[PDB]
Design a protein around this nucleic acid. Structure first.
Lengths: 95, 71, 88, 275, 131
RNA sequence: ACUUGAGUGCAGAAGAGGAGAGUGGAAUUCCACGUGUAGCGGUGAAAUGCGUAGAGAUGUGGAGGAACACCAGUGGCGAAGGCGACUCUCUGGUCUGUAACUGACGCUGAGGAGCGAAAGCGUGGGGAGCGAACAGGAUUAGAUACCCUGGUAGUCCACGCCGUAAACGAUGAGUGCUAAGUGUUAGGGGGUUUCCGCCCCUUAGUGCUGCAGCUAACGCAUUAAGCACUCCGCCUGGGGAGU
């Protein structure tokens, strides 16, 4: 496959251990397609410029996933309608 | 003579970034009112202004740099 | 395409000389398989005229090389044609 | 798809039948056929209260969940079959229970797809779940009104809905033909627009296919005697004489609104009937 | 490309023939070779020294035209068109110029000159014509 | 037989080349409610129009369509028409560099095949802005126009037909050669240079300024309209008449 470095922020209204559940389950669904996601990150509660859905700032996030080719549209489209992930912009990774 | 002031602005210490994880050179690139910087007044190269413009957009898509500013 | 397993795999499965990367039977093999996969990949969304013009130019080049190999060696050209499958 | 017929005779010169590619098997489930009697526009008295029905072919009803009360257990589409009782087709589903149920068929499905129906279920086309869990903006059909009643709402072939944005109670829905009704939130609904999208472009062509369905022909306004219909009269092909076109009862049928004014739907509309 | 070699050499000696260049290149072939010995022996250019090597080529002649503008290469014309070929019998071998120039008809015993080919009295393909 | 032609390989580079899906804002319209009053609007000057049924403006929120400002430039890519927010899948092509292989496998190409802006045409969707026909008011002797206020089709999408344009560089394609300078991207070799940066050599593409040469003059000029070769198409006074 190819590297997919897609990082989509978590919602600011989330709770703490529920946010850990969101990263846990969302990381599981991203990891179900054979992609050993060899990267991670947590940029912290960092304010954005304009609102995403309702915040004046959110809890930023990152990702580093190495897979196909099989689950980039899965982790983007299957997370497009969640309540936690505000707006996931899954950029390609060829730097 | 014989060069540009602010000589190439990225070719001296680049290259190939950023884009998402960078907010620093993105902080020094996207202009004061909110627009992207002019490529004559900033001073980037051809490929430098191309990469910093693409990463300026792709870093503006994930809400990193503001899609509009104040006056 | 083509994938590297079919570039090096196809050149490895159809190498005319021991170290001959070209050998126009090899060019008809790589161009032929890449024209087929470009044929299905053009057929998947039948509006893209750019990729279609690529399919016409590529298929025409593979035809011209097929006529070249047919003019270069008769029996070996028949064996390459009947082994490859296309040209019929 | 839609085939078109070559004009072998004059019955054929416009007519189209659909390709019948979506269907797989002919002979349906014997154990869910419910019998029917074409009623013919009649009443329980015996009078014919619906004009110009009757004449049809022998229909036979197949039992359909328009509810999907069962939940969580995934389906597995065996066959998609044809039903003369409506436009759209029906997909036969073998649940893991063995409860073989004819259930209405959204597009994009074939044999073999998993269809759950819990509130936990997916937004894969076919899965069904109440309107709270549906996110803002999905293609939804089979909407109900009261919780668990049955899918009265949208069902016919090639139709859909949205969800514009909701509260705890209710869930707003841009239905088909633009009516935005505050539909209740715990209402079970299912996901996808309804299969056999090309029902509209079916050119009927010859006369008796409307008799095959069937529909008795209609006799127009300035044709009947001035007794029987309040347009008829004149010395033949007289103009449509009286002001305010009028049904075969004394009510105008250009735009005269027929909803009850004092009615329950005064609250249940944000936006209605774009015309 | 490569429509005609002799027209490429003739265009070479022509374009360099007006450029005022000291030496001139060429594609080394049997027509550039035998035409180099004929057109060099008749006294137009200084010397052709066919500096050969791998893979093909490559002739190198010098323009033997002095101070006076337009020396012994004063104007050349494709008398034979590769594509619509000229022909000349024995009695019809035409001597180009009239008294100044000389034509080079590729005879059946070697690439002759005009007067020498008339000395053999046998014509062939009109190879080129140097007016 | 051989290798530069042409092709394959190997490694680089680049782009708004295409097709499909999804996402994002700025702005206009419309709607709901607050705030508020007597004007808003448009022009050459006005009027039609809107506004005390509360407009304009301003605050908040929602819906929907279309196009993506800044980067952006006689920049890039494409056979041409053309192509611009961002991301992904599938895909074509170009150039650079050594140089492993092949050994002329090439150039053009009437028919034939295919694509081709915008207007249109059929069906079904979509209709926020713009907007023929149309309505009103203005200017004029007249206004089937210019202007302004509105306004249908269309523009948008998918599926099919249309196959024309100043479809322009008014220059068919391929190849070889022939003064120079100055830009500008995409590369490469190098002179010292860890850097960086300057400079040369080199390609490929593209812009200006100009020698020879061409020409009726304007002008072209290594991207020729120069100098020669291959092949296709077109031209034989205007109107009549692309009838």
């Amino acid at each position: 496959m190819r590297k997919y470095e897609v990082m989509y922020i978590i919602r600011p209204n989330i709770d703490e251990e529920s946010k850990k559940a969101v990263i846990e389950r969302f990381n599981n669904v991203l990891t179900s397609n054979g992609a050993e996601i060899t990267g991670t990150k947590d940029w912290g509660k960092r304010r954005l410029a304009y609102e995403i859905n309702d915040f004046r700032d959110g809890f930023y996030q990152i990702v580093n996933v190495q897979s196909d080719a099989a689950a980039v549209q899965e982790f983007d489209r299957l997370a497009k309608i969640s309540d936690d992930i505000i707006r996931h912009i899954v950029v390609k990774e060829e730097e | 003579r014989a060069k540009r002031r602010k000589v190439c602005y990225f070719t001296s210490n680049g290259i190939t970034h950023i884009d998402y994880k960078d907010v620093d050179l993105l902080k020094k690139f996207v202009s004061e009112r909110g627009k992207i910087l002019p490529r004559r007044v900033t001073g980037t190269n051809a490929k430098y202004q191309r990469k910093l413009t693409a990463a300026i957009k792709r870093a503006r898509q994930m809400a990193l740099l503001p899609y509009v500013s104040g006056e | 395409a083509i994938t590297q397993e079919r570039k090096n795999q196809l050149i490895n499965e159809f190498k005319t000389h021991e170290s001959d990367t070209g050998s126009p039977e090899v060019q008809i093999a790589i161009l032929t398989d890449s024209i087929n996969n470009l044929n299905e990949h053009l057929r998947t969304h039948k509006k893209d005229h750019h990729s279609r013009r690529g399919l016409l130019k590529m298929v025409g080049k593979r035809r011209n090389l097929l006529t070249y190999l047919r003019n270069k060696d008769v029996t070996r050209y028949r064996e390459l044609i009947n082994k490859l499958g296309l040209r019929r | 798809a839609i085939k078109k017929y070559k004009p072998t005779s004059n019955g054929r010169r416009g007519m189209t039948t659909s390709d019948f590619a979506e269907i797989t098997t002919d002979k349906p489930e014997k154990s869910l056929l419910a019998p029917l009697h074409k009623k013919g526009g009649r009443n329980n008295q015996g009078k014919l209260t619906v004009r110009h029905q009757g004449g049809g072919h022998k229909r036979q009803y197949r039992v359909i969940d328009f509810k999907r009360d069962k939940d969580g257990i995934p389906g597995r589409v065996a066959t998609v079959e044809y039903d003369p009782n409506r436009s759209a087709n029906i997909a036969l589903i073998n649940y893991a229970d063995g409860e073989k149920r004819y259930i209405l068929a959204p597009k994009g499905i074939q044999v073999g797809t998993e269809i759950m129906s819990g509130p936990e279920a997916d937004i894969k086309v076919g899965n069904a779940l109440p309107l709270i869990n549906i996110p803002v903006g999905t293609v939804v059909h089979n909407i109900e009104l009261k919780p668990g009643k049955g899918g009265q709402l949208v069902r016919s072939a090639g139709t859909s809905a949205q969800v514009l944005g909701k509260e705890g109670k209710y869930v707003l829905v841009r239905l088909n033909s633009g009516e935005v009704r505050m539909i209740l939130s715990a209402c079970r609904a299912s996901i996808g627009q309804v299969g056999n999208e090309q029902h509209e472009l079916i050119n009927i062509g010859k006369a008796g296919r409307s008799r095959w369905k069937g529909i008795r022909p209609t006799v127009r306004g300035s044709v009947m005697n001035p007794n029987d219909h309040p347009h008829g009269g004149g010395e033949g092909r007289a103009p449509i004489g009286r002001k305010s076109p009028m049904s075969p009862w004394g009510k105008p049928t250009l735009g005269f609104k027929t909803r009850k004014k004092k009615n329950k739907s005064d609250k249940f509309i944000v936006r209605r009937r774009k015309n | 490309v490569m429509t005609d070699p002799i027209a490429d050499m003739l265009t070479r000696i022509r374009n360099a023939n007006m450029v005022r260049h000291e030496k001139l290149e060429i594609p080394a072939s049997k027509l550039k070779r035998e035409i180099a010995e004929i057109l060099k022996r008749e006294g137009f250019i200084r010397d052709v020294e066919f500096v050969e090597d791998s893979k093909q080529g490559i002739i190198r002649v010098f323009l033997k035209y002095g101070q006076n503008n337009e020396r012994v290469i004063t104007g050349l014309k494709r008398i034979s068109k590769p594509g619509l070929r000229v022909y000349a019998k024995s009695n019809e071998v035409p001597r180009v110029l009239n008294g100044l120039g000389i034509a080079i008809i590729s005879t059946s015993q070697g690439v002759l000159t005009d007067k020498e080919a008339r000395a053999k009295q046998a014509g062939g393909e009109v190879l080129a014509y140097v007016w």
